[PDB]
Amino acid sequence: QPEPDMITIFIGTWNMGNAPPPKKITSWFLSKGQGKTRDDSADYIPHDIYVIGTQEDPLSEKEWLEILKHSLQEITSVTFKTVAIHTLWNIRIVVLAKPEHENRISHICTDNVKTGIANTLGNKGAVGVSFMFNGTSLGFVNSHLTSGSEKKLRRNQNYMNILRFLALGDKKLSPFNITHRFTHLFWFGDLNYRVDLPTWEAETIIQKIKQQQYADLLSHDQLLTERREQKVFLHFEEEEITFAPTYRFERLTRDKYAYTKQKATGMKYNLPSWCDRVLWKSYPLVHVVCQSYGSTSDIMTSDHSPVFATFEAGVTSQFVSKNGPGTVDSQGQIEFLRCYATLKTKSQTKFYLEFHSSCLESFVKSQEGENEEGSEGELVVKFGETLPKLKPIISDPEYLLDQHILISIKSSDSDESYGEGCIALRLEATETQLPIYTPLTHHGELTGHFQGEIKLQTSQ
């Protein structure tokens, strides 16, 4: 029975509007409706992993698990195993997997973050799940961010609080937040970003939707505009949107958008918006391909339509050699040449690096770099040829070239990370000096750059 080198992952996000679902929701799991939809010929082919995010979910965990499992069984005739379920208030995440994956899945983590203070603490936040699938780390975040057209800044703050404080993945990766802990990170939910056009344009917007002319609407979508100005979701991807806005519908039809201000909306307009989204971030040069991104047309119990996205994702096997794990392989080494960090910080402390990777027995601390002034004000931290030689646990190129090195630059004074990034070992050549580069972030905001050269020795 060979270990897979690809799996398919289903991501679902649905704000259920505090209403039970209808008796049939199979269209969701089948990626059928509007947008980038799945070929009919694939309908019986199960995804390897189904991750279901709900918001405003009125069901017990038991009630929803029964509906989900019975839905997948009707579609595929496969009885899926429950990997994890985690609920914060009415925000829920369910991970189901094919039974053949039960012994490939380990290190299952769940967490939640509550966003806001006092007034704004009580129903918004995120839940998440992580685990290993053989040699590949997977993370999944379902967030319900602050509502309202005039609160995009609050949403961006919610995002930063969730990525700082959601405790998923390998706790030994202490300088790194969830945006660096996983081979593949999927972040979805009712992100609540709106189409930011004048209220008076509501009927014009509806007209455009009926014509399936989304271009002039997406150019005003707050998530796309905020992403373009690097205010939120820096270094995350989203598939092109080719489905109608998923909010706000009259219930029991999809023929009408309910946008007008009502006591029930706190006298706020809800212009048709793409509230319900799926984004991802994968380590550099790892295969990840979106194969569907769309909304259902036939599930109408909520004022939101369900959104689906499916992905092909590269995975690696749990590698054993004669040597590692449990020793080094002297035939392998990672050298860094002519490296320097460029930092936006106005501080003057000394900095050192930490190298973290599951190809090392444990993380490696460098010597302090040498601080110089950049020609445009910047701090440049030079490491020269001083950086340690990294000693991987396995030298086999079929293992090593699939690995990644996480880099933190830390203050000698405080031991706090000023920047985090990631370098792929999927090089064009071994035993050859090649350029490397990573942006550096902290709390998911750009704080600098790391660049230099790498020289990788494998057993071949």
Ligand X SMILES: C1CN(CC2CCOCC2)CCN1
Chain residues in the site for ligand X (CB under 6 A): 224, 227-228
Buried b (16+ CB within 10 A) or exposed e, 199-214: eebbeebbebbeeeeb
What minimum distance in Å lies between the beta carbon of 315 and ligand X?
23
What minimum distance in Å lies between the beta carbon of 290 and ligand X?
12
- In angstroms, rounded to a whole number, what is the distance separating the alpha carbons of residues 38 and 40? 7
Q: From the CB of residue 330, how many other CB atoms can be counted at a distance below 10 Å?
A: 10
Q: Which C-beta is closer to ligand X: that of 69 or that of 227? A: 227
Q: Which C-beta is closer to ligand X: that of 206 or that of 224? A: 224
3-state helix vs strand vs coil in the chain, percent to 5:
15, 35, 45
Q: Which C-beta is closer to ligand X: that of 224 or that of 328? A: 224
What minimum distance in Å lies between the beta carbon of 367 and ligand X?
34
What minimum distance in Å lies between the beta carbon of 277 and ligand X?
12
- In angstroms, rounded to a whole number, what is the distance separating the alpha carbons of residues 368 and 381? 9
Instruction: Pull the structure tokens for residue 433.
Output: 């000096």
Q: From the CB of residue 166, how many other CB atoms can be counted at a distance below 10 Å?
A: 25
What minimum distance in Å lies between the beta carbon of 31 and ligand X?
22
Q: Which C-beta is closer to ligand X: that of 213 or that of 219? A: 219
Q: What is the largest CA-CA distance in the chain?
A: 70
Q: Which C-beta is closer to ligand X: that of 46 or that of 421? A: 421
Residue among 282, 242, 265, 202 at smallest CA distance from 7:
282
Instruction: Pull the structure tokens for residue 404.
Output: 């990644």
Q: Which C-beta is closer to ligand X: that of 224 or that of 258? A: 224
Q: Which C-beta is closer to ligand X: that of 228 or that of 322? A: 228
Q: Which C-beta is closer to ligand X: that of 48 or that of 221? A: 221
- CB of 354 closer than 8 Å to CB of 324: no
- CB of 308 closer than 8 Å to CB of 292: yes
- CB of 336 closer than 8 Å to CB of 456: no
| H/E element, 308 | strand 307-314
Q: Which C-beta is closer to ligand X: that of 104 or that of 227? A: 227
Residue nearest ligand X (C-beta atom): 227
Q: Which residues contact 132 (CB under 8 A, 6 or more apart)?
A: 105, 106, 107, 138
What minimum distance in Å lies between the beta carbon of 215 and ligand X?
13
- In angstroms, rounded to a whole number, what is the distance separating the alpha carbons of residues 229 and 209? 26
- In angstroms, rounded to a whole number, what is the distance separating the alpha carbons of residues 428 and 405? 16
> What length is written for the chain?
460
Q: Which C-beta is closer to ligand X: that of 193 or that of 351? A: 193
- In angstroms, rounded to a whole number, what is the distance separating the alpha carbons of residues 458 and 171? 29
What minimum distance in Å lies between the beta carbon of 230 and ligand X?
8
Buried b (16+ CB within 10 A) or exposed e, 332-359: bbbebeebbbbbbbeeeeebbbbbbbbb
What minimum distance in Å lies between the beta carbon of 235 and ligand X?
8
- In angstroms, rounded to a whole number, what is the distance separating the alpha carbons of residues 377 and 380? 9
Query: From residue 219, how far is each of 126, 183, 208, 310, 380 by CA, in Å?
Result: 27, 31, 13, 24, 37
Q: Which C-beta is closer to ligand X: that of 176 or that of 280? A: 280
Q: Which C-beta is closer to ligand X: that of 277 or that of 442? A: 277
What minimum distance in Å lies between the beta carbon of 243 and ligand X?
16
Residue among 401, 380, 383, 403 at smallest CA distance from 449:
380
What minimum distance in Å lies between the beta carbon of 224 and ligand X?
4
Q: Parallel, antiparallel, or unpaired: how do β-strands 434-442 and 370-373 relate?
A: unpaired
What minimum distance in Å lies between the beta carbon of 411 and ligand X?
29
What minimum distance in Å lies between the beta carbon of 10 and ligand X?
23
